[PDB]
Amino acid sequence: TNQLQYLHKVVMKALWKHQFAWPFRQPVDAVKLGLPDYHKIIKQPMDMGTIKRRLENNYYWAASECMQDFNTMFTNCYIYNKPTDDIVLMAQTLEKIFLQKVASMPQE
Amino acid sequence: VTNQLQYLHKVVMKALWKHQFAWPFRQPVDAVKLGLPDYHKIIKQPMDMGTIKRRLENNYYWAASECMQDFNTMFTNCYIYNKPTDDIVLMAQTLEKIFLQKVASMPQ
Lengths: 108, 108
Ligand SMILES: Cc1noc(C)c1-c1ccccc1
Ligand SMILES: Cc1noc(C)c1-c1ccccc1
Known about the structure:
Two copies of one chain form a homodimer.
Chain A: H1 2-16, H2 30-33, H3 38-41, H4 48-56, H5 63-80, H6 86-102
Helix pairs in contact in A: 1-4, 1-6, 4-5, 5-6
One 3,5 dimethyl-4-phenyl-1,2-oxazole (A9P) binds at residues 24-25, 29, 34, 36, 78, 81-82, 88 of chain B.
């Protein structure tokens, strides 16, 4: 759709290149990061790499569905991490940009 | 008074305000009442639907994005402060899904 094209080419491209985006471009690697409780707490892992691949494989049926995945990614970060962790501030910044760009999305 | 702000008031806020899970969000978190002495130490910008509704009623917002950021802050505060297993997190997620669904059809 026009909306999914906007989410891919306008919203995602703007988040992806951001200086705080690198932790969110691929799944959380709990082994590498040494977080053995990560998958016990976060039951629906999500990241922008997964979202981008879904957008490109025509996985989504509606823009809302893609937006839900972005939300899961941010929510997972807030739920798992300590409120004072830098990663929370990084998610908040990206999330604010996501909403700004979503506000200008085409209507269909 | 913009087309988008009207949508936020008449479609988004209308849908969320009356929801069966909305009650904890209709007024600011009362840390004294709930016995949460650390709430304001962790959450620096409290937000709730009553405040947002008032702002929409009183033409406080200059742009739809500003209102959208208030909704987002309300939900994000809830995910950051509470434990992963708290019911309030599920309630917030249910409301936020509706928020995103409706926002996907907001006028461009
Ligand atoms: C992203 C993200 N969400 O939770 C954690 C933990 C991360 C993360 C932190 C550092 C590097 C990569 C991912
Ligand atoms: C909403 C909300 N966010 O954190 C807390 C704590 C609440 C809350 C829980 C029960 C009743 C009212 C607010």
